[PDB]
Amino acid sequence: QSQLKLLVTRGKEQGYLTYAEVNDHLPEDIVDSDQIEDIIQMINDMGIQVMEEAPDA
Amino acid sequence: ETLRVDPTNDRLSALVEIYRMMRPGEPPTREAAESLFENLFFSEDRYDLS
Amino acid sequence: ARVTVQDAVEKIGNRFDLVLVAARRARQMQVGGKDPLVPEENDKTTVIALREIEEGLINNQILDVRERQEQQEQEAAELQAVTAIAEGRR
Amino acid sequence: LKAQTKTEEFDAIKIALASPDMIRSWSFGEVKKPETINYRTFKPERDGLFCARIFGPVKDYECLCGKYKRLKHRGVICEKCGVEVTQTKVRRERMGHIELASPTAHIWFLKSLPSRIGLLLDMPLRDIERVLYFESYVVIEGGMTNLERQQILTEEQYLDALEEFGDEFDAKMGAEAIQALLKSMDLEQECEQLREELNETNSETKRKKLTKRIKLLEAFVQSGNKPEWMILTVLPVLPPDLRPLVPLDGGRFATSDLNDLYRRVINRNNRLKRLLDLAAPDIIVRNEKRMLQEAVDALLDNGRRGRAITGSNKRPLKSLADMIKGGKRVDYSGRSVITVGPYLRLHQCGLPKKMALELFKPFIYGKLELRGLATTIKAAKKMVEREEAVVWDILDEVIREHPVLLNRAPTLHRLGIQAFEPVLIEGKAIQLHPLVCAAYNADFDGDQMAVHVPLTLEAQLEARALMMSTNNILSPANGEPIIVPSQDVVLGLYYMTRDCVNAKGEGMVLTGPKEAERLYRSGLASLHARVKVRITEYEKDANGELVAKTSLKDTTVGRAILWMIVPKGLPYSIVNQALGKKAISKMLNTCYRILGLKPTVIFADQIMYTGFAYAARSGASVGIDDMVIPEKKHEIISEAEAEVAEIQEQFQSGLVTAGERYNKVIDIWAAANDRVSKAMMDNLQTETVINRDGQEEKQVSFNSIYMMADSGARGSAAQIRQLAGMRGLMAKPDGSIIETPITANFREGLNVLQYFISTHGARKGLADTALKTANSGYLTRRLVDVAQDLVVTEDDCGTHEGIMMTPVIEGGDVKEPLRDRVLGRVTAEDVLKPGTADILVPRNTLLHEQWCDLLEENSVDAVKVRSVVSCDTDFGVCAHCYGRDLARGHIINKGEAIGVIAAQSIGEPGTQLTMRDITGGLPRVADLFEARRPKEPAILAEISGIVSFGKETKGKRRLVITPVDGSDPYEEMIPKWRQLNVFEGERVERGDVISDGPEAPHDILRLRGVHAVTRYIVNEVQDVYRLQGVKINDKHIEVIVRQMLRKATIVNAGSSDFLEGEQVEYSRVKIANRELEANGKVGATYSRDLLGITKASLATESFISAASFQETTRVLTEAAVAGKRDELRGLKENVIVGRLIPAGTGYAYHQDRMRRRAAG
Ligand SMILES: Nc1nc2c(ncn2[C@@H]2O[C@H](COP(=O)(O)OP(=O)(O)O)[C@@H](OP(=O)(O)OP(=O)(O)O)[C@H]2O)c(=O)[nH]1
């Protein structure tokens, strides 16, 4: 709901891939060196369908 | 509107939330949650506008 | 072909094959049986092959055929040894 | 009966998972100790990371201890220590392995975008797959009661479920749990049942995940790899030499981080092994397992999760993956500062004595030992190390016809590296021919070039027949000459014309060459008068040959003497009758098209020599009085400031809109700027008075500056306008324009204020330049990466279709014609003629035969031409369909390299592109190639029907248009925002405009047509080059758009699985082999799909080529999953492997090898 709707609606497509944005719109403990790669892998490359492979994962 | 989206309701929950935001790991206590916030904008050894 | 080398390509299309065959002939000259056809005049083997190609002699089919004759000369003329070896292991 | 078991030639490489036994096959021993080198003896330990028995010996042929020394025992191992004494390079190739106790998960197949171990098992990645192997939540491994097959349980749930049943559904936790999970999984039975279930009564509400997983599972099962190999139990070891610990200077060793990693994993693994023999507390052992997981994951690929530190350095440790995820130095090379060499030819360059001495070292050695002089090789070394005169003469022999290729730093296009014949020069700097000084885009500010020596025989011939400067007469981008004379020479030839009246003139006639005697002997001037002479012209027609034509024409002294330089052919005189400006290149071009190579080259050398010589004879300089200011300057400025003063006074008393008076006053100063500019030009242009016979006449100013401007030679109108006129509107950091332009000029004094204003323009100018210079190459990389795989092959196929070429006419409302876009183009088929016959079918439009397209009047302005866009070729490009545009005058040679040359030519003029309903500039080009949808995309009618409203805002909604006719309706979506263009009831055609705005290339290609969308792209990308004034052929754009439309989408039912979007390569080759194979009903119809450069380059057959540019960690992993193999026709992937390139001089090799790989 929250994460999915915010990520999809906002990122259309954030133009310059504004990373420093939705990373703060995420819960749990922040400042980790783990969740970083799970966002730079979805935004581009396999566009459109990748944004549907993100939520399911 | 800012208050409407604010989970915290008092001083303890606020300092604890801030402590969990700054140092995400160890369970926030009483001394740690307070001393950390004090050592951010209210201590010369940790903050100074010169 | 000191400066094109363009007059050689129309004799054998695609400059690449021109490079191949010319390098082939120049390879024959630099090491092994030399014997140029067009007078040297103090030119490297690089250009000598190009001169020959321009002259009209020494192409792809030419070198291949002469290689066939070369094989028929080395093999057929020296079979007395091979045949004698053929009876080695029955 | 082959079956050879040695290291011979390979045709392909295979990538796949590695079994534990597969790892054992590489094992030349087992690392068991964290020890590296001895603390005292500095000798490799027993079973450490640098063993001698396992890997390789330290010294070449002597063992560890010293029982055996020389080559006596090169095949026999040592008695005291099993050390195979062979080479020391053996230590560089030897593998080795570590066999862990408890299983360990591979970091790549675990967490790399899609959970490879998860998706194959259908299970959440960082959620479930983490908590069950980190020893936290136990998982099930198949149950026949109450519990499913892949659910997650807690310790409480575990014991409860164990108490209810137990001893019949046993399922562990951790690594080995996931191992049994993958192992128990049956890929076959699931591949069947999934196909059954995921096809029964389901619309587009499921098909996504269905087709996805089934294709993935089918790929994995057909790949051959067993899921057991997903998590490793045996971890291989990298060779010691690839991670050595070499002693630097005075102790202080230098080791790799991999040694730290392997040492850590060894330690943790050993403790884990020891704990599984002593007391075994669950918490301790499980923690050590997680720690072993940490060490292993850190060794394979750090990334990624906190990053293991240590090593004293606050920086992370370079893991294995970090060494293969992200400039080829070469011997026989050098570099130095360049310098002009006027006395040189066009196929020659100034190569320093000492420089050439060090370069051709091995050649000098061989030649010395060959002739005599030096008794041996070392004798030659000692002979050249002591430069003994005679050696130099030998050098003059080795560099005789041995070409050396030069190179500049910023290599934009093919002409970045050009070969020349070395000429010894007493100096330490490298001299270059001033003619080819433009191709390099090089100046003599202090720039330096590098030199390379073609060692291989065929390498020398490649440099002579391809990379030679004499072979690069024309530019690969545009057919126009590239070695065209520049500033100095053009000014010279411009001064060799310029008809001046009287002044030692008179019509004293002679005969060509004789006039030269007149010039040196003074008496007569040089720029008179005109004067008449006898010109012996030469022309040819029909049957070629040469036809004389002596006559008496009225030229000048300069034209007469300059006529001697002109070759045999050419129209003569009329090429000299003009001047020196732009026709200076035209003459060179025509000479090339009507004569050939050699005569065009010597003509260039002659015009260069003549240009420089007479330029020196002229003595054109630049004094302070050369830039004469207009007298009407102060007048015009006062008038402009008068108008603006009145406007300000009006603004004071309201009246005019003060909100935009800024714009109109800008028009005032802008107009005034044009007034001063026009005044200065009209003055500085004509002037003069002379005194012909009875005096009183006017020509054109001989004012040096004007002479430089009216003859190329770096001098434009704007610059001159700033020199004597005035610097107009100046930019402001806000982006706005100042309402007080620089009234003064460089000829005059400049106030501190306006200079402090101009500094902004200079700053932003240099800044923007620094940006677009790097941005140009940034685009070039993408262009090359997407296009560097297509090469002209299969000679010349059939087909006739092709874009109808027509002169780009903005003349609809602005008048601007360009009808040279058809030349060297292969005709589609007999494109008619106002009557009959004329044009043939496959006849390529000649340079003289394109001039024949003017004898058919202005009526014929449309010709169908075969292009690279079409062409029924397979994996290449038809020679005819392309063209001929090269440095060569003929058609492109079969097996060239269209892709790279195309990309280079496109991204070459990128340096001179100004970044910003008109974007314009480099960014506009990028958006066009990437095929991005506009910020306000228009809409088109998919099927021709009757326009009618579909429920006024009934959704949702937002307007709805429904063009329905013949059969079946359509419901488009109009979002209220933005108006319309077609009333209700009206009929539309197939692809009509119903938004009147920016068009989307996707809609055009999908609906309008491929010819239409390609025409759009080419005619829109050129429009941004028109403004910049950069000439570039349309062929190259068509080339990139060719593979820009590489893939498509099939929609029906065939051997291919419907939803899969595949390239028209396999599509066409399979549809051609199905209509006449079994049945045409076993195949579907495809549909072209527009995809950007990046999206297109992303997809490629070879996994190595992909591993080059895009993210290596992804491509390498996914290619590891499915047993893929490169085989092996790409350019890029065949470069890093270090073999012959499947193009150019190669191709034939690849073709032979390709046909060779048909036996099996
Ligand atoms: N086009 C052409 N020229 C050849 C050919 N063979 C020899 N030449 C010309 O020979 C001239 C100088 O060669 P040399 O080394 O001095 O004498 P060489 O012919 O015996 O080797 C050059 O003239 P140059 O090129 O006219 O000098 P320049 O025009 O570059 O100033 C060179 O181009 C050939 O096959 N084709």
Ligand SMILES: [Zn+2]
């Ligand atoms: Zn030994």
Ligand SMILES: [Zn+2]
């Ligand atoms: Zn074709």
